[PDB]
Design a protein around this ligand. Structure first.
Ligand SMILES: Cc1cc2nc3c(=O)[nH]c(=O)nc-3n(C[C@H](O)[C@H](O)[C@H](O)COP(=O)(O)OP(=O)(O)OC[C@H]3O[C@@H](n4cnc5c(N)ncnc54)[C@H](O)[C@@H]3O)c2cc1C
Ligand SMILES: CC(C)=CCc1cccc2c3c([nH]c12)C(C)(C)[C@H]1C[C@]24CCC[C@H](C)N2C[C@@]1(C3)NC4=O
Ligand SMILES: [Cl-]
Length: 412
């Protein structure tokens, strides 16, 4: 039986823990916060991650995500003047495909499942020290050495593990954009006469709007059939007021960003009714491609945002974190106890080029999105591209199919 240490329990670490446990490994998982604590905005989980999730507990996790979904039928795309420019379908996010869902709700569902499986989960563990030998690897918690066969570091874009595992040459860096993200109860908004366009007449169907202007994108949506309201704002900034870490926002700053938008009259009420503490902001950070995700003695690997952050317009960060977790569990299973380092190296090789291709697509799309060149549809600004090579990929089948080939190359 393979002993795995997992550090960081966001989507990446929770998926790795669940999948490692399901594939028969013994997991010890470490988390810095006292309990799950996530921003209550929304994110999307597409089919390439649903094919992992659908296997858990005879579909009960998928059904719980489905119950909690934003029941969105279409995306309405406007320019900054308020002109409707495009209506997109929700292909990839309809029943049985995928979900737009409250982030904290989804993490709670994953966490509740991981805990139900009996996985050893240790909160209040801020991990900074890693070590490995030819024979084992582990961490240092409270001056105590914890040993395992391998360490999976899924501690996010500000990973402390990454310096230890990959060295410190490559660091996260500012893109020049920043983001406001918010979710709150619709009861706080409904009654505002400037919000009737959102709050009335929608007959139990959730909404999702994109407002695309030069260097500023605003998104507005609802969840749980009108019970929750969500909004956010990604914008290119000349002088930073946001930081590389997340902060609670003063929403009055976001209102000023759209001061020159004709539609501001529609959007200001949604921002202004945000309760104190329910809007967050941060710089949009990126990172150059790491030469390697794996430690010199091949027992430690960074996965998730610690290894390959994506621009938020991609909508793939959580999906690829889920693919990473499912993949590493398989590589360890196929490698077996006596060749754990081979499994770690195969896991990196299986994923490395795919995630880089997704990162590069996100960078190209962000440029078009922020140019907002509405005159000139395959040239139009959009957050929506659903290429088959992303959405039809089955990471588990890929790992089972390619392991032997890739392992042979690793072994030589
Ligand atoms: C605005 C926005 C919208 C997005 N929308 C989407 C979307 O629609 N779809 C999608 O697929 N992705 C989306 N993403 C990306 C997605 O949120 C991330 O890629 C994903 O959450 C990364 O998860 P992670 O587990 O790698 O890292 P994190 O979620 O950052 O989790 C890391 C964990 O490690 C813990 N930790 C950190 N340091 C330590 C330490 N030293 N010791 C112990 N524990 C530690 C943290 O507390 C945390 O629990 C979006 C991102 C943004 C910003
Ligand atoms: C409103 C808010 C809380 C934050 C502001 C915010 C800022 C920047 C990018 C995004 C994206 C989102 N939110 C962003 C969604 C809506 C969660 C996602 C969900 C969705 C659904 C359709 C398919 C696309 C790819 N995905 C990505 C995404 C990217 N857009 C979207 O239409
Ligand atoms: Cl690409």
């Amino acid at each position: 039986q393979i002993n795995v240490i997992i550090v960081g329990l966001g989507i990446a670490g929770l998926t790795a823990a669940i999948e490692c446990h399901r594939k028969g490994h013994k997991v010890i998982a470490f988390e810095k916060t006292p309990k799950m604590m996530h921003i209550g905005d929304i994110f999307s989980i597409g089919p390439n991650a649903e094919s992992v999730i659908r296997q858990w507990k005879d579909g009960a996790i998928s059904r719980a995500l489905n119950e909690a979904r934003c029941a969105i039928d279409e995306i309405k795309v406007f320019d900054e003047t308020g002109k409707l420019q495009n209506v997109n379908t929700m292909e990839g996010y309809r029943e049985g495909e995928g979900y737009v869902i409250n982030r904290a709700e989804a993490v709670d569902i994953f966490f509740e499942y991981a805990q139900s499986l009996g996985i050893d989960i240790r909160f209040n563990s801020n991990v900074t020290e890693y070590w490995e030998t030819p024979h084992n690897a582990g961490i240092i918690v409270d001056g105590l050495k914890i040993e395992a066969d391998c360490v999976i570091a899924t501690d996010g874009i500000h990973s402390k593990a990454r310096n230890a595992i990959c060295g410190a040459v490559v660091q996260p860096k500012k893109t020049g954009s920043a983001i406001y993200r918010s979710g709150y109860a619709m009861e706080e908004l409904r009654g505002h006469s400037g919000a009737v366009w959102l709050t009335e007449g929608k007959e139990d169907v959730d909404q999702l709007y994109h407002f695309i202007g030069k260097d500023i994108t605003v998104l507005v949506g609802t969840g749980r059939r009108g019970k929750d309201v969500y909004w956010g704002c990604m914008h290119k900034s000349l002088h930073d007021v946001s930081e590389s870490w997340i902060q609670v926002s003063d929403v009055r700053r976001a209102i000023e960003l759209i001061s020159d938008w004709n539609v501001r009259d529609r959007l200001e009420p949604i921002m202004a009714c945000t309760p104190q503490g329910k809007c967050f902001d941060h710089l949009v950070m990126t990172m150059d491609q790491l030469p390697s995700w794996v430690s010199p003695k091949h027992r430690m690997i960074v996965l998730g945002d610690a290894a390959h952050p994506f621009l938020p317009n991609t909508g793939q960060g959580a999906n690829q974190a889920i693919e990473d977790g499912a993949t590493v569990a398989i590589c360890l299973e196929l490698a077996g106890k006596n060749q754990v380092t081979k499994g770690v190296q195969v896991a990196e090789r299986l994923r490395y080029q795919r995630v880089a291709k997704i990162q590069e697509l996100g960078h190209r799309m962000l440029k078009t999105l922020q140019n907002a060149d509405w005159d000139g549809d395959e040239d139009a600004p959009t957050m929506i591209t659903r290429p088959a090579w992303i959405y039809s990929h089955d990471c588990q089948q890929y790992a089972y199919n390619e392991f032997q080939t890739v392992a042979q190359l690793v072994s030589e």
